[PDB]
Amino acid sequence: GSHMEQLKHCNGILKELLSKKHAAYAWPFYKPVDASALGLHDYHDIIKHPMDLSTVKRKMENRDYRDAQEFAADVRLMFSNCYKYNPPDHDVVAMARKLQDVFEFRYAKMPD
């Protein structure tokens, strides 16, 4: 799905995820996890491929993604990293699930 149209749909989703409408639970994913600042000294030993929305945005602007699948993989990687590092009961996981629901349902409306 290397269609320009599908990438526009992906960019729309990206814009929504970064919008005020979802800010209450999307904020933890706005920037790369600063492990040191947060005292998470084992973060990079556990998470081999960090990902966040600012990185996805940069890759989209630089036309790094060639198709929708690539984009989706990074967004899901971001959520997976959260589920892998954090205990299931952590508040950040609750926020990840909510933002992922927003993503999955709109990604499912992908024109094709």
Side-chain angles (χ1 to χ4, degrees), residues 19-80:
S19 69
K20 194 61 177 61
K21 182 172 64 174
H22 305 298
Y25 39 89
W27 69 265
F29 314 96
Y30 286 170
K31 292 297 195 305
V33 174
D34 190 328
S36 301
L38 297 164
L40 314 178
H41 307 302
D42 58 343
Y43 192 76
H44 296 292
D45 291 288
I46 295 173
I47 300 308
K48 178 182 301 303
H49 300 289
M51 186 52 56
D52 68 288
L53 297 175
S54 76
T55 298
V56 175
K57 182 172 175 290
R58 179 182 61 61
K59 292 178 67 172
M60 180 66 73
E61 307 179 319
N62 294 174
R63 287 187 286 180
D64 192 323
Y65 299 123
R66 295 196 59 212
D67 88 303
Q69 298 174 300
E70 262 199 83
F71 165 82
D74 270 352
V75 175
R76 285 159 178 163
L77 168 61
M78 180 185 71
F79 293 131
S80 295

Side-chain angles (χ1 to χ4, degrees), residues 5-40:
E5 167 173 54
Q6 298 205 315
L7 283 179
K8 290 287 189 175
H9 183 66
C10 289
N11 193 50
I13 292 172
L14 215 207
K15 286 292 299 178
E16 186 178 346
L17 299 183
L18 292 167
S19 69
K20 194 61 177 61
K21 182 172 64 174
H22 305 298
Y25 39 89
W27 69 265
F29 314 96
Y30 286 170
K31 292 297 195 305
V33 174
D34 190 328
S36 301
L38 297 164
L40 314 178

